[PDB]
Symmetry: D2
Subunit: 268 residues, 4 copies
């Protein structure tokens, strides 16, 4: 009876209880969705974290840089949700950039191997996951990825900005493919969320100046947002992802929905 009643949804990207994907998973389950989860590398940790979700959900291993994992993924999902069943939704909440590509390390000093790894995980993998899963998605389905608005440059975000610009472009091409299946593809551009790592960066993990810059970004964000922005609360973001996973945005694809308090619409 919830927003997502009866829907089978794959959620990637949980690593801590502060992960945006954890909150996406929690809200989707509150709204009646049946989930399959995917996790990278630390599956014991991730199972222990996801035990706290309101309902049980199978956890599958997925390193998006691993071709074998991607080749087997649809079969492993079908095993978890049962033969003859398909997915209605896929959430990509995956991002990574080596520390040379973010923070106080100069923009020009990031080696391309590092940048390439970040773009692989943060942008190309959105296509990789759609390739793997569209064959087991139902018409009317929905693929959602997470974005951080890269239309303008900003301090420290550096090559991760570039990776997000690439992701936005990938999403428009994934929509062309997904459309053949009756499936939508979209991104949610979220405001800053104080995940574990972000608090670590604010605390200086990538250099003092980067931490200072993020605090400034956060303060400015809430100021600009006409309805404000609470960086400690991922729930408005998770709700937005569930809106796109639902039946209520049926004519939106290849697009970007901004769950950012309206900040990007305001100069000051």
């Amino acid at each position: 009876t919830g927003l997502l009643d009866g829907k089978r949804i794959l959620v990637s990207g949980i690593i801590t209880d502060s992960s945006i994907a954890f909150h996406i998973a929690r809200v989707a389950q509150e709204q009646g969705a049946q989930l399959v989860l995917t996790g990278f590398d630390r599956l014991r940790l991730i199972q222990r974290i996801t035990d706290r979700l309101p309902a049980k959900a199978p956890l599958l291993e997925l390193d998006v840089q691993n071709e074998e994992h991607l080749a087997s993924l649809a079969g492993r999902v079908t095993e978890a949700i049962g033969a003859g069943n398909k997915l209605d939704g896929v959430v990509h909440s995956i991002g990574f950039m080596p520390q040379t590509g973010m923070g106080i390390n100069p923009f020009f000093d990031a080696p391309y191997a590092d940048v390439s790894k970040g773009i692989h995980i943060s942008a190309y993998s959105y296509a990789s996951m759609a390739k793997a899963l569209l064959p087991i998605m139902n018409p009317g389905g929905s693929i959602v990825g997470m974005d951080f608005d890269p239309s303008r440059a900003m301090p420290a975000y550096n090559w991760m900005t570039v990776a997000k610009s690439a992701l936005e472009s990938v999403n428009r091409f994934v929509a062309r493919e997904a459309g053949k299946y009756g499936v939508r593809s979209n991104l949610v551009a979220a405001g800053p969320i104080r995940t574990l790592a972000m608090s670590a960066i604010v605390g200086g993990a990538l250099g003092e100046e980067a931490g200072a810059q993020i605090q400034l970004l956060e303060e400015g964000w809430d100021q600009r947002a006409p309805i404000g922005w609470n960086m400690k609360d991922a729930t408005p973001v998770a709700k937005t992802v569930c809106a796109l996973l639902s039946d209520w945005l049926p004519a939106t694809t290849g697009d970007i929905i901004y769950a950012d308090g309206g900040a990007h619409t305001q100069l000051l």
Copy 2:
């Protein structure tokens, strides 16, 4: 139990059974909303049309060019929904441009009096309506207006394009005001919908070349849209408006959601 259960929503803009606002009203009522309707000039016609909606809804007169109508509107709404009750939602589905400002009449030949009238009704009135109704809206509420993507020029749409560009700008300022009330303001940029008037234009009501241009626009739209576009079906648009009226896009304001099949994301 629907998406809009318990919500009180004002819907403007119904004039025929093919009006986008009629379909918005129908879907909102299907999803549990309690409506108040507003109508321009032809209230007997509009009552007869809206008798076909699934539930009863009070019809109020509102000419957005009439200062008296706007000054009395909140009191008349409060009378209709009962003292102590406020609105959760407001739908602006109002547009007009004199024939000198659209169609085959040359762009340069539209007198400013005509253009000004079109901008008054199509853009300024979004601010007028927000001014009148924000004092009787609840926190968490939502103001939605209808848009037709004006970021690029196109044949025949002419000064109505300009009016929509102005509307998009107005919406960003209305978000700043609405935010003070805990209310969101957004537009839905819809693909072409074959309303009575559009079929009239396709049939040559504003000149043969304009009709030909709209048919080309419509065909191109469905081609570009990765999930296609059915100009005869307003329901995907109405669903999108209901999504914004709901609780499920709580961090989106001053913004534009595209219910256009994804066409604007694709060149060809």
Copy 3:
């Protein structure tokens, strides 16, 4: 031998020696252009100001709200530059909004008559001037208007933002008409320039909060701009307008060039 050698260019919008148009006129003359000037209302003042330009230029009266002035304009220009000669360039540097539509007066309290007047002068008149002058422009010619980036809302600029959004839309339609003549149409989106009026607003002419907001805008602008921004210097803006008036941007029309230090490309 200058950039604009041999070119005949009409420059509107001079009212003080700090007007952007004064600096446009000065630079164009330095670069070899032969000018015709147009002025509103205070022609004695404007002649006295423009006596300080490096070369003589005929001054013609043009109130863009006056239909007679617009109807006679091409004939008066042809008289000034000589029969058989046409214009190569037209600069629109005209803007106005009543004080109810800018400053600390609330957004919702601007009467539409005031907003309409501002849109007439600031947006519709770009079309009016193109209508009047395209019949006496040479192929390869260039129409340039002044813009202040309205893609996001901001404090106090209010309905002038809306007028600029409308102008951007008008410019795209003027390009369609101008193209028939082999003429380009573009806008220059300038950073903040401390004209007489702006210093007056900073000094509180439209309310204290508006003045404070502009100082904040100015400071933020220079901070964001990767090459900085000097609000006291209009010359980089004037140079950009001359670039568009020249032969060196032959494939750019309906477009917006940002002479803003790069500020709009940067979040922080």
Copy 4:
């Protein structure tokens, strides 16, 4: 006495006489610039081609994937233009994507190694070249790269679209670095130019459907462009690059100038 009189400009990207960079080089020399050229792999061919330029220019080898080439580049340039002299301009006209990432090969079938190579050459190298050359650029200098508008998806261009989206993002960060040197960074988004390779693709080199799609793109481009578009003529593009290399766009950085006939401003 030309537009670029006295300026020392590095031009990369010549491989045939139809290369956009050849035409950029030709026009810059016509306008008084003194050039240094860089070439990839086929230096005998490139010397023979560039012998046809109006003036002599040293050719240097530069594979942007080669760290040694980049590390030595500034020293080799300084050798060619003489100690104590610096560059005023740098043109990046470099792009590549393996055939798996463009054409009729499905979007999902491009291996990441191929995509990474394309992004390395087409996007990261803009940063690589700026890193190498900013230490030998004069204040007031200008870095220009070539772009093909990737804001919307389109048939066949596929991962090259993604690479261009990344480039646009890189350019905004390169502007932040370049600004420290008093140097601007910008892209020129060109309309389609019928280079050797493009004619090869139109002739079916990357599959019949891709060729058909490009012909459609080309036809639509000229139709939309308000001043038209001649895919056989690179000169308007080269002129635009020279405008950015000149002193006449001094307040534009991190930005994109569209030398596309105005096509991107028009829907139809």
